[PDB]
Assembly symmetry: C4
Amino acid sequence: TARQRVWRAFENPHTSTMALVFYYVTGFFIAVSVIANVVETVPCGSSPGHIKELPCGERYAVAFFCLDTACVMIFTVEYLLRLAAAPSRYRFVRSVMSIIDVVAILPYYIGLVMTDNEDVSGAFVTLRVFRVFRIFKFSRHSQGLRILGYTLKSCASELGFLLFSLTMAIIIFATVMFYAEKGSSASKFTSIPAAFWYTIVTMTTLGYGDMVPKTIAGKIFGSICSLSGVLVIALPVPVIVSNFSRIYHQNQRADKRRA
Amino acid sequence: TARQRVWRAFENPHTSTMALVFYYVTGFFIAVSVIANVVETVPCGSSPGHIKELPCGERYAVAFFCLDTACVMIFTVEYLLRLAAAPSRYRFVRSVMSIIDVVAILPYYIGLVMTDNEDVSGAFVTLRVFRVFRIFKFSRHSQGLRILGYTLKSCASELGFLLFSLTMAIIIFATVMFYAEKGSSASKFTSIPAAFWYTIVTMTTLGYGDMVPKTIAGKIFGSICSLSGVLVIALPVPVIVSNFSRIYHQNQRADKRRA
Amino acid sequence: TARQRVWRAFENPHTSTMALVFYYVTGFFIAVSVIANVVETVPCGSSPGHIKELPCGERYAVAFFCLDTACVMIFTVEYLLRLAAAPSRYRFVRSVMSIIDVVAILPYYIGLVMTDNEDVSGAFVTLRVFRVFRIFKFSRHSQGLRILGYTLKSCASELGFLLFSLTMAIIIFATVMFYAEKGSSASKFTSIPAAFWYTIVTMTTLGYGDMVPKTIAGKIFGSICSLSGVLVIALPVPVIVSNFSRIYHQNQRADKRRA
Amino acid sequence: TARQRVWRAFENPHTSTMALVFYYVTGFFIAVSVIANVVETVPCGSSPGHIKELPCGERYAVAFFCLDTACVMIFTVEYLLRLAAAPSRYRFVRSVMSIIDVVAILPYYIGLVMTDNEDVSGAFVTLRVFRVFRIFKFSRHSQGLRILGYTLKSCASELGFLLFSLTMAIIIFATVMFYAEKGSSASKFTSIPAAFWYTIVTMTTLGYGDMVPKTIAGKIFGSICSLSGVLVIALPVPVIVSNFSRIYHQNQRADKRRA
Ligand SMILES: [K+]
Ligand SMILES: [K+]
Ligand SMILES: [K+]
Ligand SMILES: [K+]
């Protein structure tokens, strides 16, 4: 029944002090890995023996590699233990969180096996991006009751419909703006996909201001887009508020049910 | 009983499998026409024998014309069958979906009969814009768009009042901003219609930043406009969500009446 | 009882057809006055006998003066009739709407009596601004049930508290940003009142981008300001939604009470 | 029974008219100190005998110092009486209003004892910033601030979770934007902390426009970030309004219990 004990330690950390300490140390390692990934891109000053400043990941490549490999060893042993402790190993692997784990650790090994092609580009940057997946294990650690997550799932149909309507509106407004502004001087509306950027920025009430209309027709349709954007940004608030109230009351009723 | 069978197959595609196949085929062609319209404006890049990169709709004008006319023939045939199978031709034409189909289908024929004036300026832009309403045919492919349109129809007098109040506030704030900003050096507030743009951008909380006040009075009234825009973000939500909720409740009442 | 008849015609337009036609013609004159004020600032092209283009109000000064004086005569006779028809003339004058009327018409007469000092500045622009008050008579004409107005009055305490808290937050964040950014190169945070503009723009989620932080401390506190701005723009929506629902239900219950 | 009478006069200014006078006097001095802090940074304009316009706090450093020390002596005396009249000195000091008073009152004395190092850089900025918390003493002058602070205390774990989730999303989006934008020419995404600014600006729907993506991948992920920001505008509203409504209901329950 050893698998039962280790699985109970993993899936339920507060039951045993050993489970709690393992949970806390692996959370600490997750946090240090995230911070190391963020910090290795910060340029170090004083330009030691170089024309320009180097990032922390290049000036201290060995140190950051040691930190990354320590974090990856911890994550790998933890994942293998979870795999060997799962009552249904196939079902555990089919879980989304196991997918997050595997896609978080495998970038390191892929970078290892491509050491011969050290000058790799496009795939190297993509692997370094995929290292961001380690953050998603925080929600395994900050696994507090997902009342907001449950309410977001409660509005999944509304969000899907809102995204479809947003796609329709974006295409329509982008067509209109491109044809209203294709002819301006040094125009940034060089195509309908180019106006996708303006439309998505306007309908979310960002307004960066890099692409702004310069024609009277362009400004009229940009105003229509702005009002549609006000509606877009404003709709979800009462929906989420009502759903959150309902779910919180359901959870309190379940609490008084279990008591 | 053949024409009415065809008509009910049009209304209810899920009944007959052949009707469902025709439904999915026309939906796929709608999506293809929309994507072709969006893509034909993209610059091809490194145009062969041309310094400037031509749009893909100009590099391959023959291929894009053939694809467009294929989609247009499909739409015209489908509309003609919808006209023949419809019991009341006048009322069916009066149905808003029929108007959408008509306004999406003529632009191709208008471009056809206008081939003598192939050197036009402006009108071709309007026709190519009107080609975008092929998207609205997707209303026939979703219950969400149908209920959204019903809600928008419900919020007609109320959203009209909100648009009227927004127009009032826009004129007031544009007046005060033009008069505060007309004297500035190299000012963009050259008139009150010119300040309509700044006012509508500020209320919607875009803030592109192309027109910003540069005087103390202008900045004061811009702050007032910004706060009024914060209120604008909230003004139409009660009406929209109340009408939508009423429609939702009546729909669930009908659904339980079905049971 | 003539005063009774004329007062009933004024305060209740739909009772008599004469009252309705007078109401509609004075509304038409209000609209034409508003449009004339907006249009007289639009620059006329072709620069007739001038170095630069003239606005419609200067190229056609006589025509716009005739239009303005016709509108002012109509407004003046209407206001005098209302004054002579009011059962309590002092109480009628004490009404806010009579104040709006008097402040809408008197700018014209003040401009008349200052014809000797035709080169007046600062007060002339202020009078032309005060001509915007004619728009507020639309809400006398579009006097439809102010459910939104009643709900806004229902939240008057909440809005007052929100403005006080907004003033506190603006002063605090402006102090912090000015002291974080007083030393940057060519800094636009030249004073705490200068940073009032940045703070009010950031806390409303405009982000024009003319004043942006350039220091690490400035960016940190700008991020705190941005989050506070998200809260500011987001709070009023559920409040107004609930109040609107409550007031609409109260009004429907009053309707079924009167029936 | 004199000390406790003084203490209850401090707690309940409306009881004794002399207590109310002292209350309004200290509130007026708080407002005066706040306005003096704000105004002393304004450039005086056309400095006599100086090319650069000095701030009013430097043109009249003696007058502003005298006004500041008057306000500080009033605050120090008022705090000393609050300390003497308080029954439990330790607990009263532990009360948050006492901490606010202390942190607002020391900066003047810290500047006093530091007069030897009158040539400091940076520390004086921190002290002058800490002078802004004289505003928070207005919490003693409003029930709205008190209930707002109680609500913020209630939304402690939940708003902590929201800040944690915002940090997670900010790190993820900053990573993807830095890696999409690091290769651009003259890019402002020089690191992941550098892209923290763009990410937090985009989620809050500011869009200053100083940092904008200039690559197709960057624009795609910026659009995703913009939509996530639209969701951010709605995420904390349910918690805030639910806790505030619970506090409001309990307050009305207590008020009717008073009746
Ligand atoms: K901007
Ligand atoms: K916004
Ligand atoms: K914005
Ligand atoms: K903006």
